Amino acid sequence: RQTIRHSTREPTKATTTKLVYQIFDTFFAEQINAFKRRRCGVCEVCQQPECGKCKACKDMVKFGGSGRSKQACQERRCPNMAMKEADDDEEVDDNIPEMPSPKKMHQGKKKKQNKNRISWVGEAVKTDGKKSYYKKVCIDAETLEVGDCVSVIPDDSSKPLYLARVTALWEDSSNGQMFHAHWFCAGTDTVLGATSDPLELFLVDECEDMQLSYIHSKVKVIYKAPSENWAMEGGMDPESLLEGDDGKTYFYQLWYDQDYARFESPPKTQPTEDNKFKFCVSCARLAEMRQKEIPRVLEQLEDLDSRVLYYSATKNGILYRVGDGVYLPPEAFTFNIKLSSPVKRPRKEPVDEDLYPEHYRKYSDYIKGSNLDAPEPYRIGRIKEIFCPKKSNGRPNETDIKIRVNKFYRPENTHKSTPASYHADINLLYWSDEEAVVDFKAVQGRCTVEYGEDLPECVQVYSMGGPNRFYFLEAYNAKSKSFEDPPNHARSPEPEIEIKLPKLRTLDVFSGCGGLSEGFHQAGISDTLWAIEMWDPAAQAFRLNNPGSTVFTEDCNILLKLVMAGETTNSRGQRLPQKGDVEMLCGGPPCQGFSGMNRFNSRTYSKFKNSLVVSFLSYCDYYRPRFFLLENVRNFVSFKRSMVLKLTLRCLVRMGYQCTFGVLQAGQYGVAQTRRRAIILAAAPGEKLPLFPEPLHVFAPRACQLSVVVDDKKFVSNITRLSSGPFRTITVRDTMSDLPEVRNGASALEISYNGEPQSWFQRQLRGAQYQPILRDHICKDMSALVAARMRHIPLAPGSDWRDLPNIEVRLSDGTMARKLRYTHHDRKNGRSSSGALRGVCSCVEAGKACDPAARQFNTLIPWCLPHTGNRHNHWAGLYGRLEWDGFFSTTVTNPEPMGKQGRVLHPEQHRVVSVRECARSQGFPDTYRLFGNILDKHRQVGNAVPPPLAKAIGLEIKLCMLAKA
Numbered sequence: 016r017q018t019i020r021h022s023t024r025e026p027t028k029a030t031t032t033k034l035v036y037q038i039f040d041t042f043f044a045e046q047i048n049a050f051k052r053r054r055c056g057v058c059e060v061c062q063q064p065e066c067g068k069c070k071a072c073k074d075m076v077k078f079g080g081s082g083r084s085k086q087a088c089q090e091r092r093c094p095n096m097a098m099k100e101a102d103d104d105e106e107v108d109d110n111i112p113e114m115p116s117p118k119k120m121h122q123g124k125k126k127k128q129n130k131n132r133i134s135w136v137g138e139a140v141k142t143d144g145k146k147s148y149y150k151k152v153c154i155d156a157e158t159l160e161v162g163d164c165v166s167v168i169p170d171d172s173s174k175p176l177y178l179a180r181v182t183a184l185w186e187d188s189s190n191g192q193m194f195h196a197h198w199f200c201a202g203t204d205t206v207l208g209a210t211s212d213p214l215e216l217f218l219v220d221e222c223e224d225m226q227l228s229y230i231h232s233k234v235k236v237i238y239k240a241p242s243e244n245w246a247m248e249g250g251m252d253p254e255s256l257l258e259g260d261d262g263k264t265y266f267y268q269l270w271y272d273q274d275y276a277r278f279e280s281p282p283k284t285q286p287t288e289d290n291k292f293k294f295c296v297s298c299a300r301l302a303e304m305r306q307k308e309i310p311r312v313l314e315q316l317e318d319l320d321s322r323v324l325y326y327s328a329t330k331n332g333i334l335y336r337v338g339d340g341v342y343l344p345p346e347a348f349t350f351n352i353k354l355s356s357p358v359k360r361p362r363k364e365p366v367d368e369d370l371y372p373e374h375y376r377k378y379s380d381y382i383k384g385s386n387l388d389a390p391e392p393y394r395i396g397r398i399k400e401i402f403c404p405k406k407s408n409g410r411p412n413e414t415d416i417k418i419r420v421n422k423f424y425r426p427e428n429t430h431k432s433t434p435a436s437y438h439a440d441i442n443l444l445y446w447s448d449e450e451a452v453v454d455f456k457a458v459q460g461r462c463t464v465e466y467g468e469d470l471p472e473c474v475q476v477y478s479m480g481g482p483n484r485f486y487f488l489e490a491y492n493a494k495s496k497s498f499e500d501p502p503n504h505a506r507s508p509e510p511e512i513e514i515k516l517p518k519l520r521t522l523d524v525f526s527g528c529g530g531l532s533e534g535f536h537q538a539g540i541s542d543t544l545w546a547i548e549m550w551d552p553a554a555q556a557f558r559l560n561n562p563g564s565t566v567f568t569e570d571c572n573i574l575l576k577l578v579m580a581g582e583t584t585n586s587r588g589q590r591l592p593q594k595g596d597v598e599m600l601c602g603g604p605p606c607q608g609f610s611g612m613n614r615f616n617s618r619t620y621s622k623f624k625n626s627l628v629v630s631f632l633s634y635c636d637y638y639r640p641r642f643f644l645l646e647n648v649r650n651f652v653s654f655k656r657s658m659v660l661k662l663t664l665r666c667l668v669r670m671g672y673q674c675t676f677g678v679l680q681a682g683q684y685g686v687a688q689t690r691r692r693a694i695i696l697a698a699a700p701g702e703k704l705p706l707f708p709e710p711l712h713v714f715a716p717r718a719c720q721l722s723v724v725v726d727d728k729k730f731v732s733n734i735t736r737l738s739s740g741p742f743r744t745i746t747v748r749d750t751m752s753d754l755p756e757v758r759n760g761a762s763a764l765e766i767s768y769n770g771e772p773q774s775w776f777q778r779q780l781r782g783a784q785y786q787p788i789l790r791d792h793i794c795k796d797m798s799a800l801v802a803a804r805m806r807h808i809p810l811a812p813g814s815d816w817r818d819l820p821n822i823e824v825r826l827s828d829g830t831m832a833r834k835l836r837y838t839h840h841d842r843k844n845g846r847s848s849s850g851a852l853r854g855v856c857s858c859v860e861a862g863k864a865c866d867p868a869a870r871q872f873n874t875l876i877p878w879c880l881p882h883t884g885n886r887h888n889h890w891a892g893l894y895g896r897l898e899w900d901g902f903f904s905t906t907v908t909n910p911e912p913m914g915k916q917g918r919v920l921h922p923e924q925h926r927v928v929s930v931r932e933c934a935r936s937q938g939f940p941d942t943y944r945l946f947g948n949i950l951d952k953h954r955q956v957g958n959a960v961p962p963p964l965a966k967a968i969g970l971e972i973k974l975c976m977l978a979k980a
């Protein structure tokens with residue numbers, strides 16, 4: 016801010032461990048400021064013009080006075096005063112990712128060296144064809160045995176020096192004195208970049224045979240495994256095996272996946288007792304990958320005239336058998352039912368511009384084309400046959416595996432169309448005698464589809480019981496467009512039980528009201544015994560939902576200092592968590608202060624160096640939990656030239672943790688809301704690093720750009736579902752179609768649902784509450800003028816302020832709303848059809864200034880919008896209504912009609928979305944308790960992580976727990 020222009024503006028060292036501190040101390044040397052609440056210049060108060068008749072305005076320069084009391088006009092006490100939360104992915108700085116996959120680094124020509132003396136030492140130890148392997152070799156003085164590391168020189172100088180481990184030494188009668196090189200990857204070639212230790216290397220699946228003449232020199236490389244007491248080493252002082260070793264010698268401790276930015280513990284792959292002298296883990300693994308991805312049929316069950324049928328086939332590590340469920344692209348096949356195509360349009364008639372003067376501002380959006388709609392979910396079908404053609408001789412072709420399936424219908428696939436999806440379970444299907452033939456290769460995955468009546472338990476238990484589960488009760492006949500019982504051939508007929516490991520004691524920092532913990536708990540992997548939330552209202556709410564937890568309502572920095580000093584309890588008399596108590600650490604630290612993309616500064620970094628991110632990493636380091644989870648706004652991966660992301664990974668790698676990062680879209684996991692979150696996963700040395708959750712629901716493509724660029728390298732997660740998904744997208748209708756109509760200003764904290772749930776989504780969220788009570792279906796009370804605006808926004812899909820009628824209106828308070836007057840000729844936007852001007856200030860002129868007297872007040876159409884319209888894409892979305900078929904925007908923390916981030920009017924009712932509706936958009940069970948005043952509740956809901964999203968992530972961690980032997 017320039018000064019205090021009507022502004023009502025409202026130790027410092029973070030608690031760190033010596034390891035974390037030293038990692039961050041290295042950067043942005045200083046040798047060659049508390050948060051201030053701003054006001055949202057949008058509410059009907061900030062809009063208010065300085066009256067100039069009170070101690071405030073009368074104490075300013077404008078109204079005769081001294082600029083002493085910077086206090087703003089009294090008629091401008093912003094009720095929505097707020098801190099600028101970095102939770103602002105409002106930058107879309109990746110809407111056009113134009114890049115490939117990280118080309119296997121070492122791909123390139125190397126320089127042959129002129130070592131003048133290379134002679135085998137000892138006698139051969141094998142003779143596989145033209146290859147006679149040796150145990151040792153001697154080059155110009157130097158000596159090499161397998162297991163030793165060498166260095167090769169790239170031909171291109173734009174490439175670094177290569178380091179490799181010699182896994183074999185042999186001599187080929189056709190190539191000479193060879194060796195196998197298993198390449199290492201230097202830290203600066205990983206996402207860490209220049210933030211890594213200059214001596215640290217990482218293992219990668221890159222190797223190649225090569226002539227010993229390419230060897231440049233011998234190099235020492237030591238392995239740095241986790242100590243016996245790794246989990247207790249948190250907080251200790253930086254040790255050392257030896258100085259010449261970890262201090263001055265190349266070392267490594269982890270494996271690295273360049274495509275996924277995954278740092279993992281070294282593979283354990285074993286060597287058959289046929290290659291203990293020529294084993295290469297890389298080849299071993301690469302061999303697994305090539306074989307794990309060759310669609311191949313197995314046992315056969317019949318040999319016919321033109322093709323042979325098999326009982327099962329395997330593709331991508333998954334075994335497919337006849338009768339199984341399979342996922343197919345929407346292109347795989349069509350349904351007999353003709354996808355109806357609409358015709359005609361409105362009976363030709365333009366809009367009345369005298370009445371709707373700001374409607375022309377909608378043409379730019381229109382012509383600019385509309386953004387793509389969510390893809391169709393997967394086609395689903397039962398495997399009837401698995402067959403291979405027949406070679407031009409008589410033998411089955413395996414390079415071509417085909418599958419004949421039964422087409423399953425989704426309710427929306429029948430003649431009933433989309434409306435059929437409204438009340439149907441998301442996993443409800445219909446059997447069909449329609450068949451299709453596709454290439455096994457087209458299969459996207461395996462799924463379970465069972466006849467509901469023969470299930471050993473109810474539909475709900477079966478659905479909440481496992482991934483990719485579908486069911487059917489009736490069959491569908493497209494020809495007669497009728498519903499009949501399923502045939503008998505449509506029924507059934509190493510499966511054990513459902514092992515349930517104990518929950519991990521979880522410490523959730525910056526817990527907010529609990530979204531993240533709720534989802535984790537729902538995944539059945541955790542029990543948040545300890546939470547930290549400095550903001551009281553949200554801390555109270557966490558208490559309400561987790562009676563068995565210990566909630567600390569204080570700066571996360573004070574508690575950690577206590578435990579580090581040896582304290583076991585705190586001033587309030589609460590028991591502090593100690594090493595061994597925390598098995599999992601999760602949280603979302605605020606990034607306020609360094610939310611910009613611009614590079615770090617010497618000053619701007621000294622503050623980040625003491626930010627909550629460093630404090631959170633300190634917690635991770637000290638407690639050394641089994642699994643670490645850091646969630647944040649998508650842009651966490653970009654802030655400050657990605658240094659925030661690189662230093663966070665760098666710090667985890669230094670701790671010896673396995674770690675990765677990724678970006679997820681919440682809408683892909685069950686909510687009718689767009690919200691991308693950055694996710695950093697870390698896992699203990701003896702754990703299995705989790706994978707990111709594969710999308711469950713199809714969602715708008717433009718909202719699903721998940722890739723990330725760091726220092727010109729593109730990273731993606733393990734996610735393979737990029738076009739379709741198992742379930743249809745969840746809409747606003749799915750979210751709140753069942754809610755009782757309330758009015759602007761609703762305050763009844765407890766009302767009746769007055770009806771039954773309608774959508775599958777609603778069924779899940781209202782739960783199995785004995786005496787169901789609809790809570791918090793309350794919404795902000797808008798001024799008589801704002802309310803008037805809302806009731807005048809059409810219900811037609813995509814209506815907003817640009818649809819308001821320029822008419823005089825009496826208000827609920829009694830005053831009259833005047834018409835907006837077009838006073839200046841805007842040469843850019845022209846005139847209306849009748850000849851009316853379109854400008855509302857002098858600025859629409861040639862550079863001209865803003866005649867302060869040109870401002871208008873209390874006009875249905877807000878003067879400010881056409882005023883600055885041309886420079887904000889016509890403020891599309893303001894006073895806009897949510898669409899029943901659409902989704903919420905990143906759930907607002909304080910719904911405002913003219914708020915940038917705000918497209919918040921209810922689909923049909925003339926009000927802004929209620930607290931409960933917002934909680935629905937986040938996936939919170941209707942029984943989830945919130946605490947505080949209405950604005951406090953909105954904040955709670957909005958800052959939280961959507962449970963469905965955290966649940967998905969939680970299930971990935973669960974898989975790792977079950978896999979640990």
Ligand SMILES: Nc1ncnc2c1ncn2[C@@H]1O[C@H](C[C@@H](N)CC[C@H](N)C(=O)O)[C@@H](O)[C@H]1O
Nearest residue numbers: 525527528529530531549550570571958959960
């Ligand atoms: N120094 C601090 N110590 C503890 N909590 C803080 C601190 N600074 C901010 N917070 C709280 O951190 C939270 C950040 C939230 N956006 C996180 C929400 C959370 N992941 C959820 O699912 O509900 C807010 O509730 C803040 O009030």
Ligand SMILES: [Zn+2]
Nearest residue numbers: 055058061093
């Ligand atoms: Zn305001």
Ligand SMILES: [Zn+2]
Nearest residue numbers: 066067072088
């Ligand atoms: Zn005043």
Ligand SMILES: [Zn+2]
Nearest residue numbers: 222295297298
């Ligand atoms: Zn190899």
Ligand SMILES: [Zn+2]
Nearest residue numbers: 856857858865
């Ligand atoms: Zn102006």
